Design a protein around this motif. Structure first.
Motif, short mmCIF file in Angstrom:
data_model
loop_
_atom_site.label_atom_id
_atom_site.label_comp_id
_atom_site.label_asym_id
_atom_site.label_seq_id
_atom_site.Cartn_x
_atom_site.Cartn_y
_atom_site.Cartn_z
N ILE A 193 0.78 42.82 13.71
CA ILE A 193 1.12 43.84 13.87
C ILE A 193 -0.25 44.60 13.21
CG2 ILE A 193 3.15 45.33 13.80
CD1 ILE A 193 4.81 43.57 13.66
N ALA A 194 -0.50 44.69 11.68
CA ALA A 194 -0.82 45.79 11.48
C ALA A 194 -2.27 45.59 11.61
CB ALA A 194 -1.36 44.97 9.71
N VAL A 195 -3.25 44.71 12.00
CA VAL A 195 -4.67 44.54 12.34
C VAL A 195 -4.58 45.17 14.26
CG1 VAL A 195 -6.21 43.16 13.83
CG2 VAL A 195 -5.15 42.56 11.12
N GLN B 208 -2.94 47.96 15.02
CA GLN B 208 -2.64 49.42 14.76
C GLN B 208 -4.16 49.86 14.67
OE1 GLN B 208 0.25 50.16 15.62
NE2 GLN B 208 0.39 47.83 14.96
N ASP B 209 -4.90 49.57 14.55
CA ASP B 209 -6.50 49.84 13.83
C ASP B 209 -6.93 49.33 15.67
OD1 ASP B 209 -6.27 50.48 11.56
OD2 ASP B 209 -7.03 48.26 10.90
N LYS B 210 -6.71 48.55 15.55
CA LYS B 210 -7.43 48.26 17.47
C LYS B 210 -6.29 49.44 18.84
CE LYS B 210 -7.18 44.03 19.28
NZ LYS B 210 -8.22 43.85 19.71
N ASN B 211 -5.20 49.79 18.17
CA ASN B 211 -4.23 50.73 19.18
C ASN B 211 -5.27 52.32 19.10
OD1 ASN B 211 -2.83 49.42 19.45
ND2 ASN B 211 -1.20 49.66 18.30
N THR B 212 -5.77 52.65 17.84
CA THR B 212 -6.47 53.60 17.32
C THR B 212 -7.58 53.85 17.80
OG1 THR B 212 -4.76 53.42 15.53
CG2 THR B 212 -7.21 55.26 15.00
N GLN B 213 -8.37 52.44 17.37
CA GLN B 213 -9.86 52.77 18.13
C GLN B 213 -9.93 52.99 19.62
OE1 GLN B 213 -11.64 49.02 19.62
NE2 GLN B 213 -12.75 48.79 17.82
N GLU B 214 -9.19 52.71 20.33
CA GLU B 214 -9.29 52.18 21.95
C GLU B 214 -8.92 53.46 22.19
OE1 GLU B 214 -5.87 49.32 22.72
OE2 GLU B 214 -5.04 50.84 23.88
N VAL B 215 -8.27 54.09 21.87
CA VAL B 215 -7.73 55.66 21.65
C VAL B 215 -8.39 56.78 21.59
CG1 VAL B 215 -5.81 57.71 21.96
CG2 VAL B 215 -5.21 55.22 21.80
N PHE B 216 -9.45 57.02 20.50
CA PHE B 216 -10.11 57.55 19.75
C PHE B 216 -11.76 57.44 19.76
CE2 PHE B 216 -6.21 58.68 17.68
CZ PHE B 216 -6.05 60.15 18.26
N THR C 271 5.21 31.80 5.72
CA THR C 271 3.53 32.12 6.20
C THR C 271 3.73 32.21 7.69
OG1 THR C 271 2.81 29.94 5.28
CG2 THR C 271 1.49 30.84 6.75
N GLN C 272 4.75 31.44 9.14
CA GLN C 272 4.93 32.67 9.87
C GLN C 272 4.98 34.73 9.90
OE1 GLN C 272 7.64 30.83 12.19
NE2 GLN C 272 7.22 28.45 10.81
N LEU C 273 6.02 34.55 9.03
CA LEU C 273 6.35 36.06 9.10
C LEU C 273 5.07 36.61 8.19
CD1 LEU C 273 9.57 35.38 7.17
CD2 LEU C 273 9.81 36.25 8.79
N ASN C 274 4.66 36.62 7.13
CA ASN C 274 3.22 37.05 7.29
C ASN C 274 2.14 37.40 7.79
OD1 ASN C 274 4.70 36.80 4.25
ND2 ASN C 274 3.52 35.59 3.02
N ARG C 275 1.60 36.35 8.49
CA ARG C 275 1.34 36.20 10.03
C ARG C 275 1.68 36.79 10.95
NH1 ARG C 275 1.00 30.40 10.79
NH2 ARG C 275 2.00 30.40 12.67
N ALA C 276 3.00 37.08 11.16
CA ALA C 276 2.93 37.83 12.35
C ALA C 276 3.33 39.63 11.85
CB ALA C 276 5.07 38.04 12.22
#
Ligand SMILES: *[C@@H]1O[C@H](CO[C@@H]2O[C@@H](C)[C@@H](O)[C@@H](O)[C@@H]2O)[C@@H](O[C@@H]2O[C@H](CO)[C@@H](O)[C@H](O)[C@H]2NC(C)=O)[C@H](O)[C@H]1NC(C)=O
Ligand SMILES: *[C@@H]1O[C@H](CO)[C@@H](O[C@@H]2O[C@H](CO)[C@@H](O)[C@H](O)[C@H]2NC(C)=O)[C@H](O)[C@H]1NC(C)=O
Ligand SMILES: *[C@@H]1O[C@H](CO)[C@@H](O[C@@H]2O[C@H](CO)[C@@H](O)[C@H](O)[C@H]2NC(C)=O)[C@H](O)[C@H]1NC(C)=O
Ligand SMILES: *[C@@H]1O[C@H](CO)[C@@H](O[C@@H]2O[C@H](CO)[C@@H](O)[C@H](O)[C@H]2NC(C)=O)[C@H](O)[C@H]1NC(C)=O
Ligand SMILES: *[C@@H]1O[C@H](CO)[C@@H](O[C@@H]2O[C@H](CO)[C@@H](O)[C@H](O)[C@H]2NC(C)=O)[C@H](O)[C@H]1NC(C)=O
Ligand SMILES: *[C@@H]1O[C@H](CO)[C@@H](O[C@@H]2O[C@H](CO)[C@@H](O)[C@H](O)[C@H]2NC(C)=O)[C@H](O)[C@H]1NC(C)=O
Ligand SMILES: *[C@@H]1O[C@H](CO)[C@@H](O)[C@H](O)[C@H]1NC(C)=O
Ligand SMILES: *[C@@H]1O[C@H](CO)[C@@H](O)[C@H](O)[C@H]1NC(C)=O
Ligand SMILES: *[C@@H]1O[C@H](CO)[C@@H](O)[C@H](O)[C@H]1NC(C)=O
Ligand SMILES: *[C@@H]1O[C@H](CO)[C@@H](O)[C@H](O)[C@H]1NC(C)=O
Ligand SMILES: *[C@@H]1O[C@H](CO)[C@@H](O)[C@H](O)[C@H]1NC(C)=O
Lengths: 421, 323, 119, 49
Positions: free
Chosen positions: D35-37, D39-47, D26-31
Motif C-alpha cells: 500500500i505504501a509503495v 501511494q508513491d506510484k499514485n502521486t507519480q502518475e498524476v503529477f 509477515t503477511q501484514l507487513n507485506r500488505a
C-alpha cells in the motif's frame, strides 16, 4: 450427480451450467504397518518391581532402548493408584514408536504425588524432581506402605528440604552442603538459619494415607526425526507399491501411493519433507530402501447440466484427473467407457465428443465447451471463436457503404445495491 | 482450494469438527469460484471484441509498411507473431507441493492459441479495413489511404502522408524494429505481468507454509495428533489447527478478492484501449501513448495484453512571427 | 454524461456502430441505456486513388475519397456512397504528380471557366 | 505497523508464542508495504506527466 447438484444448490431445479459439486478421492485399498524388526522385550519389570527405590533428591534414571514394549501390560495391571499421561494417550501408547525412553523412579509422600506433573511447584517439584512444561511422558504412582514403611518409622528415603534455587527440568542435585538461610555464614556446621539440606521421611505403617510412602515411576518418551529404538508390539505387514494404501512407518501414519524413490538419501536420513512439512519420502525400517509418498489423487467433481427444465441428463468432469484413475463421490455408475473424453481440464464423462465447433454454450476449459444437442445428448467440442473472413484487401480497392441501418441496443449497468445494516 | 482438504487433509475426525463451523468452507469455495469465472470474463471482454476471424491477404502490399513482426508466424504450431513469442518467452513455483495440499490451478477457457487468433483477427481487420470493422462490416481500404485518414484525424492534411509516404513507412518499420530489439534485450519491460504472477505465486506459497504452523497445538502434523491422543484430548488440539488454518484461508481468499478487483479494473481498461485505440483512433490525450494517436496493434502476452501504439510526434520546430 | 448528454466519438463506448444518441431508462438498482447508433450497410467495391493528376497538379479531396465506377472518377464521402463530380471546389492542390504513389490521371472541373466562356 | 510490537510490545515471552501463528505478521507487513509503495506510484502518475 444431478441429485448432488440439486443438493449442493439446495434447490429442486437447476439452471444450465457447470456446478462444482464435490471432491473425488481415490480411497486406500489396504493398510500397511512397518515397525522395526526388533524381538528384544523392553526391561520394564526391573524398574517397577525393584526391591529398593532411590531417594527423590537423587532420583534414578534408566534408559530403555533397542527393544519392543507392551504398555498394555502396565496400564491393564490395575496395580497403580495414579496413571497420568501428558501429550500421549494411555491407550494409543501401545500403537506408537519412540526414539528413546527414560524411566525415572523415586519414593515420595502420597500428598506429594500431585507435584509430579508438568508446570508444578513445591518442595518436590522445585527442589527434587522437576517436569518440563511440555512433558510428553506418563507418570505412574502407587502406595508402597507395604514395603517402604516399618514400625518405629523407616528413614531410608530422603528429600531435599532446602535449596538456593529451583531445579531446571530433569535436573539432579546430590550436593550435601549446609544451606545458609540467613546472612551469617554457616562455616560448614548446623546452627540458627544453617540447616542440612536433606531431610528424612518418617514412614510408619500406621500413618495417614497422605503421609504414607508412594513409589513413583515416570516414563519419558521422546519423538524425533531419529530412528525409533523403542516401539509397540504391532506386527509389520508386507510392503506394496504403486497402489493407494494406508501406511504406518515407525508410527508415521498416513495415506499415499508408495513408490520406489530415486531420492539419494544420505545414510543418516530417515524422512523427507514437503513445504507443508508433511512427509514426502521415507526409509523402510527393515529393508532401509527409500519410498516416495505421493498422495492418492483428488479433484473437483463438476457436473455439467442443461437446465432441469430441459433435461435431467448430465455429464461429469473430474478436474485434473486422468481418465485411467476414475473407478467404475459415492456414485460410480457414470465411469464406464461408453462416453469418456480426456480434456486438458480433466476427465470428461457422459459427454459425446464431436469434431464440429460452435459458440461456447457451457464452458469446460482449455477451449472445450459443452452443449445439449441432437436423439438429444450432451456434446463436447472445441469452441468457435467466430466466422472466418478474408477482407479482400487490395492496394487500389475500397468498399463504401451505399446504405445504413439505425441500430438501438441495450446496455444494462448496476448502480446500487440494497442498503443493509 | 478444497477448504476441507486444506484444513483437514484425509482426516474424517477433523472433518466432523469442521462441520461445527458451518458455511465457512462453502463461502470460501464460492468466492474462489467467482474469481475464477471472472478471469474468463476478463479475457473475453478484451480479446473477443472482433465479431469475425479476419485473415490477412496473401499479397501484403501495405504501401511500404512492414507488419511481419506483429502478424502471425505460420511456421509455428502456436501461430503467434514474432513479438508475441518474445513476450511469452520473457514472462514464462512449488506447483507440486501446492497441488498435494488440496490446492489446484484451473486452465483458462480461451487457450493461448485462441487468444493469439483473436489478436490476429483484430490486427488483420485493422490493417485491411481501418476502423470500419469496429463499427460494422470490414470495408477494405488501401493501407496508405487509411493512414492518410489517420493524419486527417490528428489535424495534418492528407497530402503530408502521400508526399512523405516512403519516409513514414521507413520510420514505422524502424520503430517496430526498436520494439523487437528492446523486448529481446531487457528483462524489466514486462514487470506489470510478472508482478501479477509473482503476487499470486507468493500468496499460494504463504498459504502452503501456514500448514506447518502449530497455532498452539502440540504439533502441526494433524495425523500425529490423532495417532497420539484420544478423542477428548485430540479434539482440543485439532480445534486449534482448524481455527488457524481456517483463518489462513480467509486471509488468502480475502486478498485474492481484492487482487481480483485490481485485475478486473485493469481488464476493463484494456478492453477500453482495445475498442478506442485498436478499433478506432482516439483523440484522448495520452490514452493511446505519447503523441497524437494514429493506430494501435494488439499483441497477446501471458495473462495480459500488449498494445503497440503508433503515434505522430512533431519534430524540428522553427520560430515564426504570427498574427 | 458522454452518451446521453452528448455524442461520443469513443468507439464502442455507447454501443456498436457510430454513436448518434442514447436514452436512459431506470431499472431496479440499475440504469438501462438505449444506445442509438449508425451502422453502415450494403457496401460496394470501387477502384480508388490517393490523388488525381490534372494539368501537372496533384489534387486531393478536401473531405471524402476518390472512387471510380470502372469508367468515370468521382469524389464521395467516406461513410455513405454519394458520388460527385471532381472539381476545383471539392479538391485541393498540393505539389506535382511525381511524388504521390498511385496517383491517377483525370480531369478536374473548374466551375468558373464555363461562366466566363458563356459570358 | 510492526506486527510483533503491536501484538507483543517489548515481551519476548509473547513473541515466542506469536511465532506459533507463523507467516501472519509477515503477511501484514507485506500488505502494508505494498500500500505504501502504491501511494508513491499514485502521486507519480498524476503529477510526473
Ligand atoms: C469486392 O470484390 C471482391 C473481388 O474483387 C473482384 O474484382 C475486382 C477487380 C472488382 O471488379 C470487384 O468488384 C470484384 O468483385 C470480392 O471478394 C471475393 O468474395 C468472394 C465471396 O463473394 C470470395 O469467395 C472471394 O475469395 C473474394 N476474393 C478475394 C480476392 O478475396 C468481395 O466480396 C467484393 N465485396 C463486395 C462488398 O462486393
Ligand atoms: C493418462 O494415464 C496413462 C497411464 O495410465 C498415460 O499413458 C501412458 O503415457 C505414457 C506417455 O506419456 C506412455 O509412455 C505409457 O506407455 C502410457 N501408459 C499406458 C498404460 O498407456 C496417459 O498418457 C495419461 N494421459 C494424460 C493426458 O495424462
Ligand atoms: C436501404 O435499406 C432499406 C432497408 O433498411 C431499404 O428500405 C426497404 O426497401 C424495400 C424495397 O427494396 C422496401 O420493400 C422496404 O419496405 C424498405 N424498408 C423500409 C424500412 O423502408 C432501402 O430501399 C435501401 N435504400 C437503398 C438506396 O438501397
Ligand atoms: C519485413 O521485415 C522483416 C523483418 O521482420 C524482414 O526480414 C528480414 O529480411 C532480411 C533480408 O532483407 C534478413 O536478413 C532478415 O533475417 C529477415 N528477418 C526476419 C525476422 O525474417 C523482411 O525482409 C521485410 N520485408 C519487406 C517486404 O520489407
Ligand atoms: C459511371 O458513371 C457515369 C456517370 O458519370 C455513367 O455514365 C453515364 O451513363 C448514362 C447511362 O447509364 C448515360 O446516359 C450518361 O450520358 C453517362 N454520362 C457520361 C458523362 O458519360 C457510367 O455509365 C457509369 N458506369 C458504370 C460502369 O457504372
Ligand atoms: C498521365 O499523363 C501524362 C501526360 O499528360 C503521362 O506522362 C507521360 O508519360 C510518358 C511515359 O508513359 C512519358 O514518355 C511522357 O514524357 C510523359 N509526359 C509528361 C508531360 O510528363 C503520364 O505517364 C500519365 N500517367 C498515367 C498513370 O497514365
Ligand atoms: C512385577 O512382577 C509381577 C509378578 O510378581 C508381574 O505380574 C508384573 O507384571 C511385574 N511388573 C512389570 C512392570 O512387569
Ligand atoms: C530386518 O529384516 C530385513 C529383512 O526383511 C533384514 O535385511 C534386516 O537386516 C533386519 N533388520 C536388522 C536390524 O538386521
Ligand atoms: C421452463 O419451461 C417453461 C415451459 O414449460 C417456460 O415457461 C419457462 O420460461 C422455462 N424456464 C427456463 C428457465 O427455461
Ligand atoms: C474426428 O476426427 C478424427 C481425426 O482427428 C477421426 O478419427 C474421428 O473419427 C472423427 N470423428 C467424427 C465423429 O467425425
Ligand atoms: C498496386 O499493385 C500493382 C501490382 O499489382 C502495381 O502495379 C501498382 O503500382 C500498385 N499501386 C500502388 C498504389 O501501390
Amino acid at each position: 450427480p444431478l441429485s448432488e447438484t440439486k443438493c449442493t444448490l439446495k434447490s429442486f431445479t437447476v439452471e444450465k451450467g457447470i456446478y462444482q459439486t464435490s471432491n473425488f478421492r481415490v480411497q486406500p485399498t489396504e493398510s500397511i504397518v512397518r515397525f522395526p524388526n526388533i524381538t528384544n522385550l523392553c526391561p520394564f519389570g526391573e524398574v517397577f518391581n525393584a526391591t529398593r527405590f532411590a531417594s527423590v533428591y537423587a532420583w534414578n534414571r534408566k534408559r530403555i532402548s533397542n527393544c519392543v514394549a507392551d504398555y498394555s501390560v502396565l496400564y491393564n495391571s490395575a496395580s497403580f493408584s495414579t496413571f497420568k499421561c501428558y501429550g500421549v494417550s494411555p491407550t494409543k501408547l501401545n500403537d506408537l514408536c519412540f526414539t528413546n525412553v527414560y524411566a525415572d523412579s523415586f519414593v515420595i509422600r502420597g500428598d506429594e504425588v500431585r507435584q509430579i506433573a508438568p508446570g508444578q511447584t513445591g518442595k518436590i517439584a522445585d527442589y527434587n524432581y522437576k517436569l518440563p512444561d511440555d512433558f510428553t511422558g506418563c507418570v505412574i504412582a502407587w502406595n508402597s506402605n507395604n514395603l517402604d514403611s516399618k514400625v518405629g518409622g523407616n528413614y531410608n528415603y530422603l528429600y531435599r528440604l532446602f535449596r538456593k534455587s529451583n531445579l531446571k527440568p530433569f535436573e539432579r542435585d546430590i550436593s550435601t552442603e549446609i544451606y545458609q538461610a540467613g546472612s551469617t555464614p554457616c562455616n560448614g556446621v548446623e546452627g540458627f538459619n544453617c540447616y542440612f539440606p536433606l531431610q528424612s521421611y518418617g514412614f510408619q505403617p500406621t500413618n495417614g494415607v497422605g503421609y504414607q510412602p508412594y513409589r513413583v515411576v515416570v516414563l519419558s518418551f521422546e519423538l524425533l526425526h531419529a530412528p525409533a529404538t523403542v516401539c509397540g508390539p504391532k506386527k509389520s505387514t508386507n510392503l506394496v507399491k504403486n497402489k493407494c494404501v494406508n501406511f504406518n512407518f515407525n508410527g508415521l501414519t498416513g495415506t499415499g501411493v508408495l513408490t520406489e524413490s530415486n531420492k539419494k538419501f544420505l545414510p543418516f536420513q530417515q524422512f523427507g519433507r514437503d513445504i507443508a512439512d508433511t512427509t514426502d519420502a521415507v526409509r523402510d525400517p527393515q529393508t532401509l530402501e527409500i519410498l516416495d509418498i505421493t498422495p492418492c489423487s483428488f479433484g473437483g467433481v463438476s457436473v455439467i447440466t442443461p437446465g432441469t427444465n430441459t433435461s435431467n441428463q448430465v455429464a461429469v468432469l473430474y478436474q485434473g484427473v486422468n481418465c485411467t484413475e476414475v473407478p467404475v463421490p459415492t456414485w460410480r455408475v457414470y465411469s464406464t467407457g461408453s462416453n469418456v473424453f480426456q480434456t486438458r481440464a480433466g476427465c470428461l464423462i457422459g459427454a459425446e465428443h464431436v469434431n464440429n465447433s460452435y459458440e461456447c454454450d457451457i464452458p469446460i476449459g482449455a477451449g472445450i465447451c459443452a452443449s445439449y444437442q441432437t436423439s438429444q445428448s450432451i456434446i463436447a467440442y472445441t469452441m468457435s471463436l467466430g466466422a472466418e473472413n478474408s477482407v479482400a484487401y487490395s492496394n487500389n480497392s475500397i468498399a463504401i457503404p451505399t446504405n445504413f441501418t439505425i441500430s438501438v441496443t441495450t446496455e444494462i449497468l448496476p448502480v446500487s445495491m440494497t442498503k443493509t445494516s | 482450494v478444497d477448504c476441507t482438504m486444506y484444513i483437514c487433509g484425509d482426516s474424517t475426525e477433523c472433518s466432523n469438527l469442521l462441520l461445527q463451523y458451518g458455511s465457512f468452507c462453502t463461502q470460501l469455495n464460492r468466492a474462489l469460484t467467482g474469481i475464477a469465472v471472472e478471469q474468463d470474463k476478463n479475457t473475453q471482454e478484451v480479446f473477443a471484441q472482433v465479431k469475425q476471424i479476419y485473415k490477412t491477404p496473401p499479397i501484403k502490399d501495405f504501401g511500404g509498411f512492414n507488419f511481419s513482426q506483429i502478424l502471425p508466424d505460420p511456421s509455428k504450431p502456436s501461430k503467434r507473431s514474432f513479438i508475441e513469442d518474445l513476450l511469452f518467452n520473457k514472462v514464462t513455483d512449488l506447483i507440486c507441493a501446492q497441488k498435494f495440499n488440496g490446492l489446484t490451478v484451473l486452465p483458462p477457457l480461451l487457450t493461448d492459441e485462441m487468444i493469439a487468433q483473436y489478436t490476429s483477427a483484430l490486427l488483420a481487420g485493422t490493417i485491411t479495413s481501418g476502423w470500419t470493422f469496429g463499427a460494422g462490416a470490414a470495408l477494405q481500404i488501401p493501407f496508405a489511404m487509411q493512414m492518410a485518414y489517420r493524419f486527417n484525424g490528428i489535424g495534418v492534411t492528407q497530402n503530408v502522408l502521400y508526399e512523405n509516404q516512403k519516409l513514414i513507412a521507413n520510420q514505422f518499420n524502424s520503430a517496430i524494429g526498436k520494439i523487437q530489439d528492446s523486448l529481446s534485450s531487457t528483462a524489466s519491460a514486462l514487470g506489470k505481468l510478472q508482478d501479477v504472477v509473482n503476487q499470486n505465486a507468493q500468496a499460494l506459497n504463504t498459504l502452503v507454509k501456514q500448514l506447518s504452523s502449530n497455532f498452539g497445538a502440540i504439533s502441526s502434523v494433524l495425523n500425529d495428533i490423532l495417532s497420539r491422543l484420544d478423542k477428548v484430548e485430540a479434539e482440543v488440539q485439532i480445534d486449534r489447527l482448524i481455527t488457524g488454518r481456517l483463518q489462513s484461508l480467509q486471509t488468502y481468499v480475502t486478498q485474492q478478492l481484492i487482487r481480483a478487483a485490481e485485475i478486473r479494473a485493469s481488464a476493463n481498461l484494456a478492453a477500453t484501449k482495445m475498442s478506442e485505440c485498436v478499433l478506432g483512433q482516439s483523440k484522448r490525450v495520452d490514452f493511446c501513448g505519447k503523441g497524437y494517436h494514429l493506430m494501435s496493434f494488439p499483441q497477446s502476452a501471458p495473462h495480459g495484453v500488449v498494445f503497440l501504439h503508433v503515434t505522430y510526434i512533431p519534430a524540428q520546430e522553427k520560430n515564426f512571427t504570427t498574427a | 454524461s458522454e452518451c446521453v448528454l452528448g455524442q461520443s466519438k469513443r468507439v464502442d463506448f455507447c454501443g456498436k456502430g457510430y454513436h448518434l444518441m442514447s436514452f436512459p431508462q431506470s431499472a431496479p438498482h440499475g440504469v438501462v441505456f438505449l444506445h442509438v447508433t449508425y451502422i453502415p450497410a450494403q457496401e460496394k467495391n470501387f477502384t480508388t486513388a490517393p490523388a488525381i493528376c490534372h494539368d501537372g497538379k496533384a489534387h486531393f479531396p478536401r473531405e471524402g475519397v476518390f472512387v471510380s465506377n470502372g469508367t468515370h472518377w468521382f469524389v464521395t464521402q467516406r461513410n455513405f456512397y454519394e458520388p460527385q463530380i471532381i472539381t476545383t471546389d471539392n479538391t485541393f492542390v498540393s505539389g506535382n504528380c511525381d511524388v504521390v504513389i498511385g496517383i491517377v490521371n483525370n480531369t478536374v472541373y473548374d466551375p468558373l471557366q464555363p461562366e466566363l466562356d458563356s459570358f
